[PDB]
Amino acid sequence: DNQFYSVEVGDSTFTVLKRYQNLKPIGSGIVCAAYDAVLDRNVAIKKLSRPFQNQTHAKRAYRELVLMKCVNHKNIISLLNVFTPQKTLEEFQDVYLVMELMDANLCQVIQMELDHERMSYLLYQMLCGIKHLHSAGIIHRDLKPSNIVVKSDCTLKILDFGLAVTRYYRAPEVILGMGYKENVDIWSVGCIMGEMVRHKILFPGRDYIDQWNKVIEQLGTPCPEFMKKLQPTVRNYVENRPKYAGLTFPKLFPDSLFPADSEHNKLKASQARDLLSKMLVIDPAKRISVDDALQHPYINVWYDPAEVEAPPPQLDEREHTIEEWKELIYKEVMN
Numbered sequence: 144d145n146q147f148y149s150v151e152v153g154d155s156t157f158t159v160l161k162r163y164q165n166l167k168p169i170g171s172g173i174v175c176a177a178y179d180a181v182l183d184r185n186v187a188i189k190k191l192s193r194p195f196q197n198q199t200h201a202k203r204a205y206r207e208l209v210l211m212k213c214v215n216h217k218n219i220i221s222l223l224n225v226f227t228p229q230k231t232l233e234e235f236q237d238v239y240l241v242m243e244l245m246d247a248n249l250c251q252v253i254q255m256e257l258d259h260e261r262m263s264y265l266l267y268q269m270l271c272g273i274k275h276l277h278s279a280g281i282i283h284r285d286l287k288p289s290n291i292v293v294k295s296d297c298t299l300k301i302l303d304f305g306l307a308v309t310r311y312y313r314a315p316e317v318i319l320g321m322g323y324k325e326n327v328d329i330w331s332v333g334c335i336m337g338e339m340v341r342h343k344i345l346f347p348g349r350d351y352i353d354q355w356n357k358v359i360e361q362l363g364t365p366c367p368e369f370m371k372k373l374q375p376t377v378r379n380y381v382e383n384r385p386k387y388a389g390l391t392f393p394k395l396f397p398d399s400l401f402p403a404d405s406e407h408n409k410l411k412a413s414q415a416r417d418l419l420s421k422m423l424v425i426d427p428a429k430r431i432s433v434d435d436a437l438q439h440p441y442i443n444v445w446y447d448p449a450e451v452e453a454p455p456p457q458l459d460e461r462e463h464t465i466e467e468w469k470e471l472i473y474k475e476v477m478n
C-alpha cells in the first residue's frame with residue numbers, strides 16, 4: 144500500500160507513484176514519458192538524482208522549483224507534480240518533476256522545413272514566454288532548442304529558466320561577461336531562428352574563444368563604441384582579434400534557403416531576413432527589444448494582448464553547504 148514502484152527506464156532507476164505507468168526513455172537529468180492514469184493524459188517525468196550533491200546541481204534545482212511553482216503562462220512549463228519517494232529528510236535522495244507531454248523537442252523541429260506561419264508562430268511563442276519571465280525580473284540568458292518542446296498542433300513551451308554544456312545560443316554579453324538587459328535573450332532567439340533557416344548551428348564553438356571567432360567571422364567586428372563597454376582586459380583580447388567587416392544578411396541567409404515560390408512566400412522570406420538582421424546584432428544597444436520583435440510584421444500576425452501581456456509572476460542564488468540545500472530542496476518538495 145506504499146504509493147511508489149520501481150522500474151528501469153532506459154538505464155537508471157525510476158521510483159514513481161503508481162499513477163504514472165508505461166514509462167519510456169525519451170531523455171538523458173534522466174527524463175521519460177509516461178501515461179498518468181489519474182489525469183488520463185501523457186506526461187514527461189524528470190529524475191533529479193541527489194540534487195543537493197553540489198552547489199551547481201543545488202542552485203539550479205532550487206531556482207527551477209521555486210520558479211516553476213509561481214510562473215503561470217502557456218509558453219513556459221506548467222509543473223503538474225513534484226514528489227520524492229524517500230519518506231524522511233534523513234533518507235531523501237531524489238526529486239521527480241512531472242509536466243504534460245509534447246510530441247517534439249525543438250531540435251527535431253529545426254531539422255525540418257517550416258512554412259512561415261509555423262516558423263513565425265514558434266518565434267512568437269518564444270517571445271511571449273521570454274516576455275513573461277522578463278516581467279518577473281527573470282532574464283533567462285540561455286535559451287536553447289533542447290530546452291524548448293512542441294505539440295503537433297504547433298504550441299511551444301520553454302522548459303528551463305536558464306543560467307543561475309551547449310554554449311552556441313548565448314549572447315555576446317554573456318560570452319564576454321559584460322552586463323545585460325532583457326534583449327540578451329533576443330540573441331539566443333535569433334540563433335534559433337537562424338538555425339531554422341540554415342539547418343546548421345549558427346556558431347558551432349569548442350569554447351567561448353572558438354565561438355567568438357565564429358560570431359565576428361560573419362557579423363563582423365563590433366563597432367568602436369561596443370568595445371568601449373568591455374572591461375579593460377577582455378576589451379584588450381577582443382580588440383587584438385583579427386578584424387572582419389563580415390557578410391551582409393542576404394549573403395548570410397541567401398535566397399537559396401527560402402521557400403520562395405508563392406508571392407506570400409517571397410514577401411515573408413524577406414520579412415524573416417529583416418527580423419533576423421535585427422535580432423543577430425552584437426551590440427545590445429543596437430539589438431531589437433522583445434517588445435519591438437512582437438510589432439515586427441513577421442510576428443505581429445499572431446499578436447495577442449492576453450498572451451503577450453500576462454500578469455507578472457524571496458530573492459534566489461545564495462551560498463549554502465550541501466547539507467543546507469538537502470533541507471531547502473526537501474522543504475520545497477513537501478510544499
Ligand SMILES: CO[C@H]1CC[C@H](C(=O)Nc2cc(-c3ccnc(Nc4ccc(F)cc4)c3)ccn2)CC1
Pocket residue numbers: 168169170174176187188189220222223240241242243244245246247248292302
Ligand atoms: C521518443 O520520444 C518522442 C515523444 C515525445 C518526445 C519528447 O521529448 N517530449 C517532451 C519532452 C519533454 C522534456 C524533455 C527534456 N527535458 C524535460 N525536462 C523536464 C522539466 C520539468 C518537468 F516537470 C519535466 C521534465 C522535459 C517535455 C514534454 N514533452 C519527443 C519524441
